[PDB]
């Protein structure tokens, strides 16, 4: 388990809008449309999307940028 | 004398007050 | 969905719109079958079917017949849920008053029409006419005639000249005045004549009626025409066991209104006589009154039940209404609890959970989970394999358990830290295993209190849990920088005796090559646990770039301290160790471990500080005998001197030579002083008891006994309990206070006697039930205090303001309180930093004074700081994040969003449960360092002797020191002697200046807060100038000011019969003490201004919470202060629309105003108003918080009167709504939406 967030409030300031990008990741996989960017050590979707956090690879901008990309790949799925 | 959860209600005139267990 | 709330007076066509048909009997069931009675109270034509999608009949019976209407019943079918939200009503034959408007304390219908209340009663009792619409006639449109004067006035005029009597008569004057009309008349009325009652009954009026006419309710709607009714389901009739029936007292009051208004209209087509029907009218109103509202009439008794019946208002209103029961806090799912156990072995992240409370609590989860991996063919076959407990499943709660939070409650919830996140740990038994190092955080002994838990379901609140609302988060205290994580007793007493020297044991003097060689030495016997050791040692520092080096050398330590060694992380220096590690030091290494090497291995250091204390602490063997409490054999000696010398006194007193006040005050004096005389003489015989020889003869050390470790280390007791178990034990008083004439002399080490256990039973009393009804008291003041301040955010990070707050080192007339570094730290400076001198400018407008400033300030010394406050914030409806400063639990600058205001509110209301209800019983400067004479706000005067003497009541003394700081502030009286000036230099300890001198604990908070001024007021002249004495003795001698440079139409009326201290020939500035006594706050502001009575306030409060020795920070009764001036008065209009005399929050005007002044266009001024705790939180625009809080009867019929819209702004009424908190994590889908 993920005993302190400490990093995660230090890689994303506001230690608010870490729950919150955290908890949009944690939907997105499991809710199974995807999956994790870490090897998940049989830990919810919670303490891996905490993990993915203090790597700095996932933050609001990352996801953001991701759905904005989804978005157009859907408009292409127009056909 | 400390630990506060009961008064102490003998005491020197001045001192706080206890606030003993 | 939807958005803002309004609220308004009924119109009868909208109460008709709400209702689908008209009850016309007072029957509620069949009495056979239970069926609704149509159309009754309970109907099934006007409201719903009883059974789901099924006509009453059952002609139209089956499921696909969807919104079709019966025609042998009348019944639509649908759910039988819509039975509990449609709508009916009653069509009263007379008109009856709405008894809301009536007896609001500003009574809305008497406001109204400029009446007063008594006469409208009359009105409405059939006592006395009234005229209305007159036309030409003698008397205006309202007036009040007898009978007898009705008799002959209708013969007077028989038309032209409408007189009724009754609620018919109330409404034909609401109807027949349009306000307009009466408007524009006030208008030159409250113009021309000054009369304050007539500018006071204009703000009011006048309001009244143009906030009135803006939204549109027609004043004829305070008067009720059509009475809606409740759904039958919110009122049921529901059949219980045995054949009882169960209803609410709602069904009886319908019931009788019913009843009464179908025979007032039989009576009217029976065509009865006027008093009949008079009588009816007024019966009719008393029905109408006891429903709508029970209590402000007879107070209706309930059908063979002598208690009152349950009315609207009174489901509504009240600690028991659906406000505070339902709304505000609430019954929760997925939720359960337990006594509590300790469970050591637990790291600080986790608990110990039962396994059945675990299974019971996740079964949605369990069910999902078995479900999912194919273990179970459907939920029904889950449900059957739990209720099984079939061994498979436990696997699976370890699964859903592993990574889910749960939350921790104890009952007295005082601050955040009373709710805690931790890991579930399945255990067997029943009990709930809790962390003990967050006992204190809890207040949770193990005497048999019970916790409960908590499941958080959504991803969102698991995520809230794991990140804010963790154990191991949630370290320093909120209210202050102090760890709440401390050890408490058992590991404290464990590391005492672990580290600790005394004069010999097993290899004392020895040399080992580190810790490990000290551990293999303990544990094999060989060497003692306390011993002098020098040992090499390796500890770290990170050193020059932040690049970690280490250090070995030679410590001179113990062989304990080095065992300890190991578990210190790499960071600390060695010297936190070398010490005997009371409780005081225990904290500060996990203070300095948190600061340097972060949370992460804080946590680790604590929870393996635990185990070795816990562990040590058992090794010990520690315990306590009778034989460790000492016994002086002087006690004895000092009780038969005592004993002497009281009797003689008593030849003494027995011969009249002594009073006999004063020789009972002699007595107490010199009991008083064999009681210490006592303590001392065992105190030395304890604390030092120890006579040990070491190569040499005998030398003495710190005791080691039992009772003495548990004392000094701050595990268990203080000096006072010793001192009771061992010596003589006080002196009590009687229930008048009188302390008593024969302290005992008993301990409870020897056996007490009849006396004075009778006598100590009094306090004992006394301190209980203070305990016991001050805690409610203290919980009735946390509320106050939510209330008032809680609606507060982070809603911007910063709005530009300069204002800010002088800070010095607090000095109340001794010696320094409260250094001001505990007043500055971890606030953002308010204006530039200099020297005295202006050398440069060493730190700027807005860096956030952390630690490396305030060491920094403390090198340049410079005591005056301007620092940034939150009552000066220029924000406005909430607080910038640079004016509140940095404080949390994390040690960073505040997040934008969190709500401070309820945080500040917690903190003041935790050392709530440590103060008291009741209170127990109750020449000249020495200055104590050495320094230099500073004489400030003093004249002074050479005498015969040469000796500076001072002529001003206001002289201050400081000490300057060589480097410019003062830490020595008195207060020199009038007429002092001083051998010094200013200007000299003095010894320490010398006497710089002589001169001749000649009850509630708790709720001295409270009043303060309330704003409540003292019982007995001082007062304060107006502005400064030369002052003297006027016009004679009519219960008050006039006070002439006089100011400079113009004249003072200026004059007060003080009452001569008090006596006064203002010099009638000497100068006295604006604020300065005419008299003596306490003073009243709101007086305070409007003299000396706004940051001077928030200093006076924060201090007071201060000074109050030190003395029982709680740390909280200025920063949360700075927010409060701000909430409390938040309303002010205005005093000229200017180019606005306000009021002469109205009250309108500080806010709203500023930002109006403003733009108003950016604009060409005159502003208005205000001034600052001081409004209670209890008051300002009525000043709340959202008025749904406001009936939350106080009492909601008249604050709904004022904004419904004013037809206040509600766009729920704040926190507490979303909190009714049930949406999305605007503070936390929803701040930022808030701050989408409102800038949407
Ligand atoms: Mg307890
Ligand atoms: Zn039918
Ligand atoms: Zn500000």
Same mark, same amino acid.
């Given at each position: 388990?993920?005993?302190?967030?400490?990093?995660?409030?230090?890689?994303?300031?506001?230690?608010?809008?870490?729950?919150?990008?955290?908890?949009?990741?944690?939907?997105?996989?499991?809710?199974?449309?995807?999956?994790?960017?870490?090897?998940?050590?049989?830990?919810?979707?919670?303490?891996?999307?905490?993990?993915?956090?203090?790597?700095?690879?996932?933050?609001?901008?990352?996801?953001?940028?991701?759905?904005?990309?989804?978005?157009?790949?859907?408009?292409?799925?127009?056909? | 004398?400390?630990?506060?959860?009961?008064?102490?209600?003998?005491?020197?005139?001045?001192?706080?007050?206890?606030?003993?267990? | 969905?939807?958005?803002?709330?309004? *609220?308004?007076?009924?119109?009868?066509?909208?109460?008709?719109?709400?209702?689908?048909?008209?009850?016309?009997?007072?029957?509620?069931?069949?009495?056979?079958?239970? @069926?609704?009675?149509?159309?009754?109270?309970? #109907?099934?034509?006007?409201?719903?079917?009883?059974?789901?999608?099924?006509?009453?009949?059952?002609?139209?019976?089956?499921?696909?017949?969807?919104?079709?209407?019966?025609?042998? #019943?009348?019944?639509?079918?649908?759910?039988?849920?819509?039975?509990?939200?449609?709508?009916?009503?009653?069509?009263?034959?007379?008109?009856?008053?709405?008894?809301?408007?009536?007896?609001?304390?500003?009574?809305?219908?008497?406001?109204?029409?400029?009446?007063?209340?008594?006469?409208?009663?009359?009105?409405?009792?059939?006592?006395?006419?009234?005229?209305?619409?007159?036309?030409?006639?003698?008397?205006?449109?309202?007036?009040?005639?007898?009978?007898? $004067?009705?008799?002959?006035?209708?013969?007077?005029?028989?038309?032209?000249?409408?007189?009724?009597?009754?609620?018919?008569?109330?409404?034909?004057?609401?109807?027949?005045?349009?306000?307009?009309?009466?408007?524009?008349?006030?208008?030159?009325?409250?113009? &021309?004549?000054?009369?304050?009652?007539?500018?006071?009954?204009?703000?009011?009026?006048?309001?009244?009626?143009?906030?009135?006419?803006?939204?549109?309710?027609?004043?004829?709607?305070?008067?009720?025409?059509?009475?809606?009714?409740?759904?039958?389901?919110?009122?049921?009739?529901?059949?219980?066991?045995?054949?009882?029936?169960?209803?609410?007292?709602?069904?009886?009051?319908?019931?009788?209104?019913?009843?009464?208004?179908?025979?007032?209209?039989?009576?009217? !087509?029976?065509?009865?006589?006027?008093?009949?029907?008079?009588?009816?009218?007024?019966?009719?109103?008393?029905?109408?009154?006891?429903?709508?509202?029970?209590?402000? =009439?007879?107070?209706?008794?309930?059908?063979? +039940?002598?208690?009152?019946?349950?009315?609207?208002?009174?489901?509504?209103?009240?600690? $028991?209404?659906?406000?505070? $029961?339902?709304?505000?806090?609430?019954?929760?799912?997925?939720?359960?609890?337990?006594?509590?156990?300790?469970?050591?072995?637990?790291?600080?992240?986790?608990?110990?959970?039962?396994?059945?409370?675990?299974?019971?609590?996740?079964?949605?989860?369990?069910?999902?989970?078995?479900?999912?991996?194919?273990?179970?063919?459907?939920?029904?076959?889950?449900?059957?394999?739990?209720?099984?407990?079939?061994?498979?499943?436990?696997?699976?709660?370890?699964?859903?358990?592993?990574?889910?939070?749960?939350?921790? +409650?104890?009952?007295?919830?005082?601050?955040?830290?009373? *709710?805690?996140?931790?890991?579930?740990?399945?255990?067997?038994?029943?009990?709930?295993?809790?962390?003990?190092?967050?006992?204190?955080?809890? +207040?949770?002994?193990?005497?048999?209190?019970?916790?409960?838990?908590?499941?958080?379901?959504?991803?969102?609140?698991?995520?809230?849990?794991?990140?804010?609302?963790?154990?191991?988060?949630?370290?320093?205290?909120?209210?202050?920088?102090?760890?709440?994580?401390?050890?408490?007793?058992?590991?404290?007493?464990?590391?005492?005796?672990?580290?600790?020297?005394?004069?010999?044991?097993?290899?004392?003097?020895?040399?080992?090559?580190?810790? @490990? &060689?000290?551990?293999?030495?303990?544990?094999?016997?060989?060497?003692?646990?306390?011993?002098?050791?020098?040992?090499?040692?390796?500890?770290?520092?990170?050193?020059?770039?932040?690049?970690?080096?280490?250090?070995?050398?030679?410590?001179?330590?113990?062989?304990?301290?080095?065992?300890?060694?190991?578990?210190?992380?790499?960071?600390?220096?060695?010297?936190?160790?070398?010490?005997?590690?009371?409780?005081?030091?225990?904290?500060?290494? /996990?203070?300095? #471990?948190?600061?340097?090497?972060?949370?992460?291995?804080?946590?680790?250091?604590?929870?393996?500080?635990?185990?070795?204390?816990?562990?040590?602490?058992?090794?010990?063997?520690?315990?306590?005998?009778?034989?460790?409490?000492?016994?002086?054999?002087?006690?004895?000696?000092?009780?038969?001197?005592?004993?002497?010398?009281?009797?003689?006194?008593?030849?003494?007193?027995?011969?009249?030579?002594?009073?006999?006040?004063?020789?009972?005050?002699?007595?107490? !004096?010199?009991?008083?002083?064999?009681?210490?005389?006592?303590?001392?003489?065992?105190?030395?015989?304890?604390?030092?008891?120890?006579?040990? +020889?070491?190569?040499?003869?005998? &030398?003495?050390?710190?005791?080691?006994?039992?009772?003495?470790?548990?004392?000094?280390?701050?595990?268990?007791?203080?000096?006072?309990?010793?001192? $009771?178990?061992?010596?003589?034990?006080?002196?009590?008083?009687?229930?008048?206070?009188?302390?008593?004439?024969?302290?005992?002399?008993?301990?409870?080490?020897?056996?007490?006697?009849?006396?004075?256990?009778?006598?100590?039973?009094?306090?004992?009393?006394?301190?209980?039930?203070?305990?016991?009804?001050?805690?409610?008291?203290?919980?009735?003041?946390?509320?106050?205090?939510?209330?008032?301040?809680?609606?507060?955010?982070?809603?911007?990070?910063?709005?530009?303001?300069?204002?800010?707050?002088?800070?010095?080192?607090?000095?109340?007339?001794?010696?320094?309180?409260?250094?001001?570094?505990?007043?500055?730290?971890?606030?953002?400076?308010?204006?530039?930093?200099?020297?005295?001198?202006?050398?440069?400018?060493?730190?700027?407008?807005?860096?956030?004074?952390?630690?490396?400033? #305030?060491?920094?300030?403390?090198?340049?010394?410079?005591?005056?700081?301007?620092? =940034?406050?939150?009552?000066?914030?220029?924000?406005?409806?909430?607080?910038?994040?640079?004016?509140?400063?940095?404080?949390?639990? =994390?040690?960073?600058?505040?997040?934008?969003?969190?709500?401070?205001?309820?945080?500040?509110?917690?903190?003041?209301?935790?050392?709530?449960?440590?103060?008291?209800?009741?209170?127990?019983?109750?020449?000249?400067?020495?200055?104590?360092?050495?320094?230099?004479?500073?004489?400030?706000?003093?004249?002074?005067?050479?005498?015969?002797?040469?000796?500076?003497?001072?002529?001003?009541?206001?002289?201050?003394?400081?000490?300057?020191?060589?480097?410019?700081?003062?830490?020595?502030?008195?207060?020199?009286?009038?007429?002092?002697?001083?051998?010094?000036?200013?200007?000299?230099?003095?010894?320490?300890?010398?006497?710089?200046?002589?001169?001749?001198?000649?009850?509630?604990?708790?709720?001295?908070?409270?009043?303060?807060?309330?704003?409540?001024?003292?019982?007995?007021?001082?007062?304060?002249?107006?502005?400064?100038?030369?002052?003297?004495?006027?016009?004679?003795? @009519?219960?008050?001698?006039?006070?002439?000011?006089?100011?400079?440079?113009?004249?003072?139409?200026?004059?007060?009326?003080?009452?001569?019969?008090?006596?006064?201290?203002?010099?009638?020939?000497?100068?006295?500035?604006?604020?300065?003490?005419?008299?003596?006594?306490?003073?009243?706050?709101?007086?305070? /502001? =409007?003299?000396?201004?706004?940051?001077?009575?928030?200093?006076?306030?924060?201090?007071?409060?201060?000074?109050?919470?030190?003395?029982?020795?709680?740390?909280?920070?200025?920063?949360?009764?700075?927010?409060?202060?701000?909430?409390?001036?938040?309303?002010?008065?205005?005093?000229?209009?200017?180019?606005? !629309?306000?009021?002469?005399?109205?009250?309108?929050?500080?806010?709203?005007?500023?930002?109006?105003?403003?733009?108003?002044?950016?604009?060409?266009?005159?502003?208005?001024?205000?001034?600052?108003?001081?409004?209670?705790?209890?008051?300002?939180?009525?000043?709340?625009?959202?008025?749904?918080?406001?009936?939350?809080?106080?009492?909601?009867?008249?604050?709904?019929?004022?904004?419904?009167?004013?037809?206040?819209?509600?766009?729920?702004?704040?926190?507490?009424?979303?909190?009714?709504?049930?949406?999305?908190?605007?503070?936390?994590?929803?701040?930022?889908?808030?701050?989408?939406?409102?800038?949407?």
């Amino acid at each position: 388990a993920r005993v302190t967030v400490q990093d995660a409030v230090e890689k994303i300031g506001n230690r608010f809008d870490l729950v919150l990008v955290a908890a949009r990741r944690a939907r997105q996989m499991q809710v199974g449309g995807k999956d994790p960017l870490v090897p998940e050590e049989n830990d919810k979707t919670t303490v891996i999307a905490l993990r993915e956090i203090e790597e700095g690879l996932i933050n609001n901008q990352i996801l953001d940028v991701r759905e904005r990309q989804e978005q157009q790949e859907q408009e292409a799925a127009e056909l | 004398g400390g630990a506060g959860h009961v008064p102490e209600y003998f005491v020197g005139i001045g001192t706080p007050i206890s606030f003993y267990g | 969905e939807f958005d803002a709330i309004k *609220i308004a007076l009924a119109s009868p066509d909208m109460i008709r719109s709400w209702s689908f048909g008209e009850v016309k009997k007072p029957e509620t069931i069949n009495y056979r079958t239970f @069926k609704p009675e149509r159309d009754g109270l309970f #109907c099934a034509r006007i409201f719903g079917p009883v059974k789901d999608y099924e006509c009453l009949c059952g002609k139209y019976k089956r499921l696909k017949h969807r919104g079709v209407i019966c025609e042998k #019943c009348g019944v639509e079918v649908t759910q039988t849920k819509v039975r509990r939200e449609r709508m009916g009503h009653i069509e009263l034959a007379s008109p009856t008053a709405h008894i809301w408007f009536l007896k609001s304390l500003p009574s809305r219908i008497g406001l109204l029409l400029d009446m007063p209340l008594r006469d409208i009663e009359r009105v409405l009792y059939f006592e006395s006419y009234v005229v209305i619409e007159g036309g030409m006639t003698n008397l205006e449109r309202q007036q009040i005639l007898t009978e007898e $004067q009705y008799l002959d006035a209708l013969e007077e005029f028989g038309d032209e000249f409408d007189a009724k009597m009754g609620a018919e008569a109330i409404q034909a004057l609401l109807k027949s005045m349009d306000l307009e009309q009466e408007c524009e008349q006030l208008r030159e009325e409250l113009n &021309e004549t000054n009369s304050e009652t007539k500018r006071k009954k204009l703000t009011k009026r006048i309001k009244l009626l143009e906030a009135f006419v803006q939204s549109g309710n027609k004043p004829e709607w305070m008067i009720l025409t059509v009475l809606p009714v409740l759904p039958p389901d919110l009122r049921p009739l529901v059949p219980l066991d045995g054949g009882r029936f169960a209803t609410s007292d709602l069904n009886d009051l319908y019931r009788r209104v019913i009843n009464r208004n179908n025979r007032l209209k039989r009576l009217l !087509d029976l065509a009865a006589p006027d008093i009949i029907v008079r009588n009816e009218k007024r019966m009719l109103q008393e029905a109408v009154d006891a429903l709508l509202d029970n209590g402000r =009439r007879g107070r209706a008794i309930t059908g063979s +039940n002598k208690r009152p019946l349950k009315s609207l208002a009174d489901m509504i209103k009240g600690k $028991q209404g659906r406000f505070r $029961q339902n709304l505000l806090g609430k019954r929760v799912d997925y939720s359960g609890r337990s006594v509590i156990t300790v469970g050591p072995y637990l790291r600080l992240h986790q608990c110990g959970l039962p396994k059945k409370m675990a299974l019971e609590l996740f079964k949605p989860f369990i069910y999902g989970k078995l479900e999912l991996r194919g273990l179970a063919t459907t939920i029904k076959a889950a449900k059957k394999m739990v209720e099984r407990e079939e061994a498979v499943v436990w696997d699976i709660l370890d699964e859903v358990i592993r990574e889910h939070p749960v939350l921790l +409650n104890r009952a007295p919830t005082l601050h955040r830290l009373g *709710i805690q996140a931790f890991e579930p740990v399945l255990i067997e038994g029943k009990a709930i295993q809790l962390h003990p190092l967050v006992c204190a955080a809890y +207040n949770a002994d193990f005497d048999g209190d019970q916790m409960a838990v908590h499941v958080p379901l959504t991803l969102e609140a698991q995520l809230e849990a794991r990140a804010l609302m963790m154990s191991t988060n949630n370290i320093l205290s909120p209210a202050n920088g102090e760890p709440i994580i401390v050890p408490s007793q058992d590991v404290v007493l464990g590391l005492y005796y672990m580290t600790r020297d005394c004069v010999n044991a097993k290899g004392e003097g020895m040399v080992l090559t580190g810790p @490990k &060689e000290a551990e293999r030495l303990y544990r094999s016997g060989l060497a003692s646990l306390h011993a002098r050791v020098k040992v090499r040692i390796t500890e770290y520092e990170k050193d020059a770039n932040g690049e970690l080096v280490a250090k070995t050398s030679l410590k001179d330590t113990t062989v304990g301290r080095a065992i300890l060694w190991m578990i210190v992380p790499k960071g600390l220096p060695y010297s936190i160790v070398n010490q005997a590690l009371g409780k005081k030091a225990i904290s500060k290494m /996990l203070n300095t #471990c948190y600061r340097i090497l972060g949370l992460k291995p804080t946590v680790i250091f604590a929870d393996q500080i635990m185990y070795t204390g816990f562990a040590y602490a058992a090794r010990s063997g520690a315990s306590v005998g009778i034989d460790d409490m000492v016994i002086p054999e002087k006690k004895h000696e000092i009780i038969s001197e005592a004993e002497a010398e009281v009797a003689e006194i008593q030849e003494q007193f027995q011969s009249g030579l002594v009073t006999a006040g004063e020789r009972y005050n002699k007595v107490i !004096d010199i009991w008083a002083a064999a009681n210490d005389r006592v303590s001392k003489a065992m105190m030395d015989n304890l604390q030092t008891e120890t006579v040990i +020889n070491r190569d040499g003869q005998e &030398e003495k050390q710190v005791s080691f006994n039992s009772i003495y470790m548990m004392a000094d280390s701050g595990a268990r007791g203080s000096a006072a309990q010793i001192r $009771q178990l061992a010596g003589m034990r006080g002196l009590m008083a009687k229930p008048d206070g009188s302390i008593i004439e024969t302290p005992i002399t008993a301990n409870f080490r020897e056996g007490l006697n009849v006396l004075q256990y009778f006598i100590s039973t009094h306090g004992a009393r006394k301190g209980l039930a203070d305990t016991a009804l001050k805690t409610a008291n203290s919980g009735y003041l946390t509320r106050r205090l939510v209330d008032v301040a809680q609606d507060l955010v982070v809603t911007e990070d910063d709005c530009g303001t300069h204002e800010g707050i002088m800070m010095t080192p607090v000095i109340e007339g001794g010696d320094v309180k409260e250094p001001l570094r505990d007043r500055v730290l971890g606030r953002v400076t308010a204006e530039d930093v200099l020297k005295p001198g202006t050398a440069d400018i060493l730190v700027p407008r807005n860096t956030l004074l952390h630690e490396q400033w #305030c060491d920094l300030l403390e090198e340049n010394s410079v005591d005056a700081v301007k620092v =940034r406050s939150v009552v000066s914030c220029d924000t406005d409806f909430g607080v910038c994040a640079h004016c509140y400063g940095r404080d949390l639990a =994390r040690g960073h600058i505040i997040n934008k969003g969190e709500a401070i205001g309820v945080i500040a509110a917690q903190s003041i209301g935790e050392p709530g449960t440590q103060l008291t209800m009741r209170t127990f019983h109750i020449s000249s400067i020495q200055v104590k360092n050495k320094g230099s004479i500073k004489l400030s706000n003093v004249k002074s005067v050479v005498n015969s002797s040469g000796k500076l003497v001072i002529t001003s009541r206001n002289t201050e003394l400081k000490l300057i020191d060589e480097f410019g700081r003062t830490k020595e502030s008195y207060k020199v009286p009038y007429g002092a002697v001083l051998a010094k000036g200013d200007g000299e230099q003095v010894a320490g300890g010398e006497t710089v200046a002589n001169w001749d001198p000649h009850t509630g604990g708790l709720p001295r908070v409270a009043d303060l807060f309330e704003a409540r001024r003292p019982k007995e007021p001082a007062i304060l002249a107006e502005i400064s100038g030369i002052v003297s004495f006027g016009k004679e003795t @009519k219960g008050k001698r006039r006070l002439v000011i006089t100011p400079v440079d113009g004249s003072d139409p200026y004059e007060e009326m003080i009452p001569k019969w008090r006596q006064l201290n203002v010099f009638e020939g000497e100068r006295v500035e604006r604020g300065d003490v005419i008299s003596d006594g306490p003073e009243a706050p709101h007086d305070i /502001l =409007r003299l000396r201004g706004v940051h001077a009575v928030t200093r006076y306030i924060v201090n007071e409060v201060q000074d109050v919470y030190r003395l029982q020795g709680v740390k909280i920070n200025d920063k949360h009764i700075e927010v409060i202060v701000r909430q409390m001036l938040r309303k002010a008065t205005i005093v000229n209009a200017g180019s606005s !629309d306000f009021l002469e005399g109205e009250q309108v929050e500080y806010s709203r005007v500023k930002i109006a105003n403003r733009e108003l002044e950016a604009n060409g266009k005159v502003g208005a001024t205000y001034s600052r108003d001081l409004l209670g705790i209890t008051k300002a939180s009525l000043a709340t625009e959202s008025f749904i918080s406001a009936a939350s809080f106080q009492e909601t009867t008249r604050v709904l019929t004022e904004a419904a009167v004013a037809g206040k819209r509600d766009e729920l702004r704040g926190l507490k009424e979303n909190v009714i709504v049930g949406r999305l908190i605007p503070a936390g994590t929803g701040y930022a889908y808030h701050q989408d939406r409102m800038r949407r």
